[PDB]
Amino acid sequence: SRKLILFIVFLALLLDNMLLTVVVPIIPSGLLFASKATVQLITNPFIGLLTNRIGYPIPIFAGFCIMFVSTIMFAFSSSYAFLLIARSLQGIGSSCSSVAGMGMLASVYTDDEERGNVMGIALGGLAMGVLVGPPFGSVLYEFVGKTAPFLVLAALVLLDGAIQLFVLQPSRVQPESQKGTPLTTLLKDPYILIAAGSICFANMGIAMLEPALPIWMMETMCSRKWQLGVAFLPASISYLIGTNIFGILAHKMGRWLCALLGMIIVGVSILCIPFAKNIYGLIAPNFGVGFAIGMVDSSMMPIMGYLVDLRHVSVYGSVYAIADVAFCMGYAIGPSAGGAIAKAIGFPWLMTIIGIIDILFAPLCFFLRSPPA
Ligand SMILES: NCCc1c[nH]c2ccc(O)cc12
């Protein structure tokens, strides 16, 4: 049925982010950090144009064979080249599983109201993956061994792939009934660009904040190392709550208004992080940041599907490749550019710049109220 497709997409995204987050504490123990995101950004539009040619089931199932190969390559690798190869393979997989899975969800839940909350649930998949990533990784790392986390995650990826092969049955290539509108015509749409830009700036704010916040906490607050890991918890829990609630709330409120308010709340929250003196001062603003990132993503993915349905041809592979490029731009240029700006003009000014950009971008979501057909 359809809820099994929703579960498959949720599980793919959850395992993808659990891997992405169990890898990050092991790596130091620069290019490797941005490698997955940039390779996924490169191979997003290709998958977008491919799902319209072979269908959704096959490029979503290749996303389990690529993520499984990446996972096992992480567990039995020592060299730096092999870790880079493993992270690039994870990037290609994730591209396959995010783009093809969101396309499948939008193709199956073909109703504007239902698509909202199923996108919300699939997105909360990423929050549940990031949130349960580090603890699982650590406990399985030290209580069993250093190859343990990745081999157990590989077993989980295999079980998810078994569910995939039993639900989707990717045996045969099935092209779409109608040829989807080209990628350039989509990219010339002022509304698809506004949606992608709102997702891009929200996630770039959060992706520049995550790595820059610990480097500032150890300098201003003299925080211990456990504090650095705990100070970012409100973001993930709040993103989980925000996505799961606003998938259902945004269509009653209006997706344009939910996106506008999410942008303004991300802006204000990020403008209000540098004013915190102690760790208890980074609970409320980080909560606002994560809550509003969810408020924006759970409102702007269904709108992507809707904007394609209303104006262009009903093929969702490319437009969700565009949405996933907007996602990945932030996580690719986040660490590097954020560290560069913080190393040059400081962390408070970086946060003020990001907040100003988000607040000034917010009024552009007004143009999503009633776009013409
Ligand atoms: N839009 C998903 C981003 C998101 C939610 N919570 C997070 C915590 C850290 C991070 O880099 C990113 C996130």
Tally Cβ neighbours within 10 Å of residue 239. Answer: 28
Distance of alpha carbon 280 from the chain centroid? 27
Closest residue CA from atom 8 of ligand 1:
236
Centre of ligand 1 to C-alpha 129, Å, is 10
In what helix (H) or strand (E) does residue 257 lie, and over which residues does it extend?
helix 255-271
CATH-assigned architecture of domain 1-168: Up-down Bundle (1.20)
Residue 346 Ramachandran class (φ > 0 left, ψ -120 to 50 alpha, else beta)? left
In angstroms, rounded to a whole number, what is the distance separating the alpha carbons of residues 86 and 78?
11
Query: Identical fold at 1-168 and 179-373?
Result: yes
Helix axes 2-23, 57-75, angle to 10 degrees: 30
Q: How far is CA 244 from CA 62, 79, 357, in A?
A: 28, 40, 26
Q: Domain locations in the chain? A: 1-168, 179-373
Q: Which parts are annotated binding residues for serotonin?
A: 126, 130, 203, 206, 210, 232, 239, 297, 331
DSSP 182: P
Q: For tokens 């941005």, name the residue.
A: 34
Determine the atom of ligand 1 nearest the C-alpha atom of 235.
Answer: 6
DSSP 362: G
Q: How far is CA 120 from CA 14, 232, 356, in A?
A: 13, 21, 27
* Residue 308 tokens, joined: 């394609």
Pocket mutation for ligand 1, best pick of 210, 266, 287 (most atoms within 8 Å of C-beta) = 210
Q: Which parts are annotated binding residues?
A: 126, 130, 203, 206, 210, 232, 239, 297, 331
In angstroms, rounded to a whole number, what is the distance separating the alpha carbons of residues 272 and 311?
39
Of 295, 322, 327, give the one whose Cα is nearest residue 308. 322
Contact partners, residue 267, CB within 8 Å, separation at least 6: 354, 355, 356, 357, 358, 359, 362
**Residue 239 CB–ligand 1 contact under 6 Å:** yes
Of 14, 121, 20, give the one whose Cα is nearest residue 328. 20
**Residue 200 CB–ligand 1 contact under 6 Å:** no
Closest residue CA from atom 6 of ligand 1:
236
Centre of ligand 1 to C-alpha 137, Å, is 18
Q: Are 136 and 22 in contact (CB under 8 A)?
A: yes
Closest residue CA from atom 7 of ligand 1:
236
Q: Which fold has domain 179-373?
A: Growth Hormone; Chain: A; (1.20.1250)
In angstroms, rounded to a whole number, what is the distance separating the alpha carbons of residues 215 and 102?
35
Distance of alpha carbon 193 from the chain centroid? 18
Q: How far is CA 56 from CA 9, 40, 228, 314, in A?
A: 12, 17, 40, 14
Any alpha helices (H) in the chain, and if so which ranges? 2-23, 31-54, 57-75, 80-108, 112-131, 133-143, 148-167, 183-187, 190-220, 225-230, 233-253, 255-271, 284-310, 317-345, 347-361
- 3-state DSSP of 25-79: CCCCCCHHHHHHHHHHHHHHHHHHHHHHHHCCHHHHHHHHHHHHHHHHHHHCCCC
**Residue 130 CB–ligand 1 contact under 6 Å:** yes
Question: What distance, in Å, lies between the first and last C-alpha atoms of the chain?
Answer: 31
Tell me the structure's resolution in angstroms, rounded to a single decimal. 3.0
Of 327, 299, 309, 308, give the one whose Cα is nearest residue 95. 327
Of 115, 167, 369, 367, give the one whose Cα is nearest residue 255. 369
Centre of ligand 1 to C-alpha 169, Å, is 32
* Residue 356 tokens, joined: 């100003």
Q: Are 301 and 245 in contact (CB under 8 A)?
A: no
Pocket mutation for ligand 1, best pick of 102, 128, 130 (most atoms within 8 Å of C-beta) = 130
**Residue 293 CB–ligand 1 contact under 6 Å:** yes
Closest residue CA from atom 3 of ligand 1:
203
**Residue 206 CB–ligand 1 contact under 6 Å:** yes
In angstroms, rounded to a whole number, what is the distance separating the alpha carbons of residues 365 and 349?
25
Please spell the DSSP secondary structure of 8-23, one letter per residue. HHHHHHHHHHHHHHHH
Pocket mutation for ligand 1, best pick of 17, 33, 126 (most atoms within 8 Å of C-beta) = 126
Q: Are 115 and 88 in contact (CB under 8 A)?
A: no
Compute the half-sphere exposure of residue 52: CA atoms within 13 Å on the CB side of its CA: 19
**Residue 235 CB–ligand 1 contact under 6 Å:** yes
In angstroms, rounded to a whole number, what is the distance separating the alpha carbons of residues 196 and 174?
29
Please state how this structure was obtained: cryo-EM
In angstroms, rounded to a whole number, what is the distance separating the alpha carbons of residues 273 and 297?
21
In the chain the beta strands, taken as DSSP E runs, fall at none
Q: Would you call 113 exposed, middle or buried from its count of C-beta atoms within 10 A (0-12, 13-18, 19+)?
A: exposed
Tally Cβ neighbours within 10 Å of residue 48. Answer: 28
Centre of ligand 1 to C-alpha 69, Å, is 25
Helix axes 190-220, 317-345, angle to 10 degrees: 30
Closest residue CA from atom 9 of ligand 1:
210
Centre of ligand 1 to C-alpha 291, Å, is 10
Pocket mutation for ligand 1, best pick of 293, 324, 358 (most atoms within 8 Å of C-beta) = 293
Q: Are 96 and 63 in contact (CB under 8 A)?
A: yes
